[model samples]
Target: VRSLNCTLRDSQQKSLVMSGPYELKALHLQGQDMEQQVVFSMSFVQGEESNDKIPVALGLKEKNLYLSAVLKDDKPTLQLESVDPKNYPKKKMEKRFVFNKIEINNKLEFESAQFPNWYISTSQAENMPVFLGGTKGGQDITDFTMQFVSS
Candidate 1:
C-alpha cells in the first residue's frame, strides 16, 4: 500500500486537456477544479511489478475515508466508504471495492474485479460526477494518465 497524491487525468483525446484529476468525498465522487490539486492515498496488494494488474484501495487526503466502487442504486459510481486503506487487507467489505490498476504504456485503467468492464471515469465537461461506465460508448472514459505529485 502507498500513501501519496495520485492524480489520474482523464483521456486527452479531445485536447480536453483541462479535465479531471479525479476527486472523491461526501459519499460521492467528482473531478476537482481545472487545476486539480486533490490527491488520495493508494492501498494495493504487496509485492507486485509496477505495471502489473494490482488490487487497490483509495483514500481521500484528509477525508479519512476510502472510495468504494459500487453498483449503488443500479448505477455504477464511487461512494465514500469508511474502510481505511491502512488496513485494506482485513476481513472487510474491502472485497468489493477492489480495483485492478492496470498500466498500459503509462496510461491508467481501473478495472474493478467486482464490477468488470466498468471503469472509474470522468468527463471533459468539468464539475461532473466521477462515475463508472464501459469502453463501448462516449461516456466510458477508460483511459487516464496517472501522475504522482508532491502536493
Candidate 2:
C-alpha cells in the first residue's frame, strides 16, 4: 500500500480514463461521441481526511472540478462543481466526495467512505461512464488508473 504523491506534474495526468473522452452528465459519465484521448487533470486540494486520506478532485473545463458523488438509490454520480483551485479553502464536500483509495493485491480501488461496500467503477466497453458498484466483478470492468492533472 502506498500513498499517491502530494504534488505532481502534468505527467501525472495520464489516461486513467484511457478510453473515450467522457463528460460528467446527469445520467452517467456520458461518453463523448469522438475518438480521441482527451486526458484531464485531477487536483487534490489541500485537505485531509482521517489517517492521511486526501480528497481527489477531477478537473474538466473552466475552473470546474469533476466531482464524484453518490446520489439517490446509492448510485454514484459525477458532476461539474466549480471552485477556485488556488483560493478555495478546504472545500466542504459532503462525505460522498471523499473516496477511500486503497490498494490491494496490486490493484487500486476507490471505495466510498460514506457508503461502504459500494465502489466506483467504469464500464467494460467504451462510451460508458464510471458508476458505483460492488467489488464483485472482473478487473476489466472496474479498472481506473488514477493520477493528477490540471487541465
Candidate 3:
C-alpha cells in the first residue's frame, strides 16, 4: 500500500499559521529486493476512507525517527474536505489561502489543513529488520518526504 497526496499553500497575504522551515524524505522500495532493510511505517488517512476516516500511525522499523512518536501530531488536523475550490486544480488560487486562517476563510481550518496523507506497506516480509521477513516483517515502507511550514 502506498498513497500520498498533499497540497498546502498560503503565500502569506495575511493569515499566519504556517509554522517554520520544512524538509522531509522517505525511501524504502524493496518488496522483493532493492537494497534490503525494511519494516517502516507512517500513516494518515482522512479523505479516501469510510465514514470520513481519520487514522494515524508511526511504527519506525529500526527506531529513531526522532524517537518516532506523535505520529499525526503534524497538527493541521488532517486536511481536505472540499468546498468546491474548483477541486484543487493546481494553483486554484494557491489553495485559496491557509496556514491557520486569515480574514476568515477557515473551512474547518481549511479541510483540516490541506490533506496530508501517506502510506507505506507493500509487503516484503515487512523486513522485520533481523528476522528478514520470517515472522514479523509487516511494516514495509518505501518512501516519504515531508517539509512543514505554511504561510
Candidate 4:
C-alpha cells in the first residue's frame, strides 16, 4: 500500500490516504471537514508508453477515473457522462496525461502528449482541485507546485 502526503502551494496539508493496494483515497482530505465527500482520486494507468514517465488518473470511488487533458476547446478539462454525471471509469477512455516528476522540487508536474502547450495545474488554496492551464512555462499562480510525500 502507498500513502501520499499532498501539500499545496500555500503549505496546506492533505493526504491521499490509501485505502487499498492500488487505489488512492476515495475522497480528498478523507478525515477532515470534507469527510466522505466525493472527489477525484489519483491512480496509475497501464498499457501505454509514457516515454518512461508515469501516467496518472484522477477520479473517485469505483466511478470517476480521469486524466487531465485539453478537450476540444483550449480549456483544461475532464468530461463526465451526461446520463449519470457521476458515472466514471467510462468505457470511452480519454487520452492519458503523464507526470514529469521533479524530485528535487518534491513535486509532480502533469503533462500531456496530446496537448503540448497545456499542463495540469491548480490554484494556491487550501484544497484545490487540479485543473488545466497555461503558465507561460513559469512559476505563476497557474503553476501549482504540488509537493507529494509517498509512504
Identify the runs in model 4 with alpha carbons over 4 angstroms from their true place: 1-31, 34-41, 47-52, 65-68, 72-76, 80-93, 96-104, 125-130, 136-151
The reply for model 1, stretches above 4 Å from the true place, is: 13-36, 46-51, 84-93, 136-138
Best by TM-score: 1
Model 2 residue 48 distance off true place after TM-score fit, in angstroms: 8.7
Q: Candidate 3 regions off by >4 Å?
A: 1-37, 41-50, 66-151
Candidate numbers, best TM-score first, in rank order:
1, 2, 4, 3
Across 1-151, the per-residue lDDT of candidate 3 in tens digits comes to: 2323222212221111212121122223324532232232323422323333333332233233311111255422222222342342222122212122112223111121233322221233321221001121234432222322221
If scored against the real structure, what TM-score would every candidate get?
0.68, 0.54, 0.20, 0.47
Task: Kindly indicate the candidate among 1 and 3 with the higher lDDT.
Answer: 1
Q: Could you give me the TM-score of model 1 versus the true structure?
A: 0.68
Q: Candidate 1 lDDT (Cα, whole model)?
A: 0.59
lDDT of 1 by residue, 1-151 (tens): 3455766566753212212334441112335633434466676643233547877766655655666777768876666666544655332335566677887777778777677777777665545556666663676566777667675
What local distance difference test score does each model get?
A: 0.59, 0.45, 0.24, 0.42
Once model 4 is optimally superposed onto the true structure by TM-score, how far is the C-alpha of residue 150 displaced, in angstroms? 13
Instruction: Rank the models by lDDT, top first.
Output: 1, 2, 4, 3
What's the lDDT for candidate 2?
Answer: 0.45
Local lDDT at 114 for model 1: 71
lDDT of 2 by residue, 11-69 (tens): 11223332333353111132562223444444444345544444554444343454456
Tens digit of per-residue lDDT, candidate 4, span 21-104: 323232235345544333444555542445445555554444433444546564556333222445444434346433332222
Residue 37 of candidate 4: its Cα lDDT? 37
Worst 10 residues of 2 by lDDT: 5-14
Q: What is the lDDT of residue 108 in candidate 4?
A: 49
